[PDB]
Scaffold this active site. Sequence first.
Site, PDB file in Angstrom:
ATOM      1  N   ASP A   1      41.366  28.905  38.298  1.00 13.97           N
ATOM      2  CA  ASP A   1      41.187  29.068  39.749  1.00 13.97           C
ATOM      3  C   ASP A   1      42.222  28.319  40.551  1.00 13.97           C
ATOM      4  OD1 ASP A   1      40.286  29.392  42.257  1.00 13.97           O
ATOM      5  OD2 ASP A   1      38.266  28.650  41.863  1.00 13.97           O
ATOM      6  N   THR A   2      43.270  29.041  40.970  1.00 18.92           N
ATOM      7  CA  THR A   2      44.332  28.393  41.755  1.00 18.92           C
ATOM      8  C   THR A   2      43.862  27.949  43.136  1.00 18.92           C
ATOM      9  OG1 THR A   2      45.097  30.560  42.562  1.00 18.92           O
ATOM     10  CG2 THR A   2      46.108  29.782  40.558  1.00 18.92           C
ATOM     11  N   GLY A   3      42.737  28.464  43.613  1.00 14.27           N
ATOM     12  CA  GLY A   3      42.184  28.062  44.898  1.00 14.27           C
ATOM     13  C   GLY A   3      41.371  26.793  44.826  1.00 14.27           C
TER      14      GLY A   3
HETATM   15  C1  LIG Z   1      37.382  19.782  45.447  1.00 17.24           C
HETATM   16  O1  LIG Z   1      37.539  20.752  44.412  1.00 17.24           O
HETATM   17  C2  LIG Z   1      37.134  21.982  44.830  1.00 17.24           C
HETATM   18  C3  LIG Z   1      36.657  22.254  46.111  1.00 17.24           C
HETATM   19  C4  LIG Z   1      36.202  23.534  46.433  1.00 17.24           C
HETATM   20  C5  LIG Z   1      36.224  24.514  45.470  1.00 17.24           C
HETATM   21  S1  LIG Z   1      35.626  26.127  45.778  1.00 17.24           S
HETATM   22  O2  LIG Z   1      35.002  26.583  44.536  1.00 17.24           O
HETATM   23  O3  LIG Z   1      34.817  26.080  47.016  1.00 17.24           O
HETATM   24  N1  LIG Z   1      36.926  27.109  46.088  1.00 17.24           N
HETATM   25  C6  LIG Z   1      37.740  26.703  47.222  1.00 17.24           C
HETATM   26  C7  LIG Z   1      38.187  27.808  48.175  1.00 17.24           C
HETATM   27  C8  LIG Z   1      37.051  28.560  48.842  1.00 17.24           C
HETATM   28  C9  LIG Z   1      39.148  27.220  49.218  1.00 17.24           C
HETATM   29  C10 LIG Z   1      37.606  27.767  45.005  1.00 17.24           C
HETATM   30  C11 LIG Z   1      37.390  29.284  45.010  1.00 17.24           C
HETATM   31  O4  LIG Z   1      38.328  29.882  44.080  1.00 17.24           O
HETATM   32  C12 LIG Z   1      35.974  29.731  44.680  1.00 17.24           C
HETATM   33  C13 LIG Z   1      35.580  29.461  43.225  1.00 17.24           C
HETATM   34  C14 LIG Z   1      34.152  29.935  42.954  1.00 17.24           C
HETATM   35  C15 LIG Z   1      33.929  31.169  42.344  1.00 17.24           C
HETATM   36  C16 LIG Z   1      32.626  31.613  42.153  1.00 17.24           C
HETATM   37  C17 LIG Z   1      31.538  30.926  42.704  1.00 17.24           C
HETATM   38  C18 LIG Z   1      31.762  29.680  43.268  1.00 17.24           C
HETATM   39  C19 LIG Z   1      33.060  29.211  43.413  1.00 17.24           C
HETATM   40  N2  LIG Z   1      35.762  31.154  44.983  1.00 17.24           N
HETATM   41  C20 LIG Z   1      35.068  31.625  46.015  1.00 17.24           C
HETATM   42  O5  LIG Z   1      34.678  30.842  46.884  1.00 17.24           O
HETATM   43  C21 LIG Z   1      34.800  32.990  46.090  1.00 17.24           C
HETATM   44  C22 LIG Z   1      35.352  33.726  47.125  1.00 17.24           C
HETATM   45  C23 LIG Z   1      34.996  35.061  47.315  1.00 17.24           C
HETATM   46  C24 LIG Z   1      34.071  35.702  46.450  1.00 17.24           C
HETATM   47  C25 LIG Z   1      33.498  34.976  45.398  1.00 17.24           C
HETATM   48  C26 LIG Z   1      33.901  33.638  45.242  1.00 17.24           C
HETATM   49  C27 LIG Z   1      32.508  35.552  44.589  1.00 17.24           C
HETATM   50  N3  LIG Z   1      32.493  35.061  43.226  1.00 17.24           N
HETATM   51  C28 LIG Z   1      31.389  34.952  42.431  1.00 17.24           C
HETATM   52  O6  LIG Z   1      30.246  35.089  42.847  1.00 17.24           O
HETATM   53  O7  LIG Z   1      31.640  34.549  41.170  1.00 17.24           O
HETATM   54  C29 LIG Z   1      30.657  34.532  40.176  1.00 17.24           C
HETATM   55  C30 LIG Z   1      29.747  35.759  40.112  1.00 17.24           C
HETATM   56  C31 LIG Z   1      31.470  34.433  38.877  1.00 17.24           C
HETATM   57  C32 LIG Z   1      29.774  33.292  40.362  1.00 17.24           C
HETATM   58  C33 LIG Z   1      32.651  37.073  44.522  1.00 17.24           C
HETATM   59  C34 LIG Z   1      32.644  37.623  45.949  1.00 17.24           C
HETATM   60  C35 LIG Z   1      33.816  37.042  46.721  1.00 17.24           C
HETATM   61  O8  LIG Z   1      34.956  37.844  46.338  1.00 17.24           O
HETATM   62  C36 LIG Z   1      36.573  24.210  44.126  1.00 17.24           C
HETATM   63  C37 LIG Z   1      37.026  22.940  43.811  1.00 17.24           C
END
Ligand SMILES: COc1ccc(S(=O)(=O)N(CC(C)C)C[C@@H](O)[C@H](Cc2ccccc2)NC(=O)c2ccc3c(c2)[C@H](NC(=O)OC(C)(C)C)CC[C@@H]3O)cc1
EC number: 3.4.23.16
Lengths: 99, 99
Positions: free
Chosen positions: A25-27
């Site tokens: 996860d690059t984000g």
């Molecule tokens: C301090 O370290 C950190 C701080 C914050 C984060 S974070 O997880 O909040 N995030 C930061 C971003 C928002 C600036 C990383 C990000 O990659 C996150 C990383 C992330 C991914 C998934 C859930 C939580 C967080 N993804 C999403 O927030 C994300 C965005 C959109 C969508 C999803 C997730 C959804 N993903 C999803 O539900 O994934 C499953 C089914 C696998 C759970 C699908 C729908 C939509 O496309 C991680 C480490």
Amino acid sequence: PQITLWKRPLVTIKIGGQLKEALLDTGADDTVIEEMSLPGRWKPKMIGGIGGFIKVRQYDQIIIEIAGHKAIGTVLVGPTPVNIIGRNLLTQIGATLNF
Amino acid sequence: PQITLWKRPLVTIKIGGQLKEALLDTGADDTVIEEMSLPGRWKPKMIGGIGGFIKVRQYDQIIIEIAGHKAIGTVLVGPTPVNIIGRNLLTQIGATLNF
Ligand SMILES: COc1ccc(S(=O)(=O)N(CC(C)C)C[C@@H](O)[C@H](Cc2ccccc2)NC(=O)c2ccc3c(c2)[C@H](NC(=O)OC(C)(C)C)CC[C@@H]3O)cc1
Ligand SMILES: [Cl-]
Ligand SMILES: [Cl-]
Ligand code: NA
């Protein structure tokens, strides 16, 4: 390897003697793992994203094997809906985004 | 380009004639941008992140440039903390993860 992004970039990791699946996860600044035990000291932290904030335990100097590549760094443990390998460990395995 | 991950992978995007900053995010299935005006009809979507779920507005077939690369696709608009370019558009610009 070269991982395309047609589907989620999931890999197997080894952490604390356990195999887990995790998202590259690059984000994510930091690596965040679902609840598990890790040895040593920790301190509480809050991290936020879509949906708001969760409380995690911060463990420093943890070894992970990511897709066969060993790295060490901080790991956050708490109620994340998916295991996330963030930039703090992606750098150590030499991961880049290319286009 | 080859983007390393020592810092956040921020790029400039252009949408609606306007330049904005966004994060290239392999952990996001979809692209989510902060509140702005986009043309056409939208449909509802709920997406789940680290802290829970939020409601967003889904706009299809939107013209968007990402780091100079032209794309046309779906953009979600809602209360995200950062503009995020997810895999739906990373694949259009030919991005891969490499290590
Ligand atoms: C301090 O370290 C950190 C701080 C914050 C984060 S974070 O997880 O909040 N995030 C930061 C971003 C928002 C600036 C990383 C990000 O990659 C996150 C990383 C992330 C991914 C998934 C859930 C939580 C967080 N993804 C999403 O927030 C994300 C965005 C959109 C969508 C999803 C997730 C959804 N993903 C999803 O539900 O994934 C499953 C089914 C696998 C759970 C699908 C729908 C939509 O496309 C991680 C480490
Ligand atoms: Cl670290
Ligand atoms: Cl490097
Ligand atoms: Na430690």
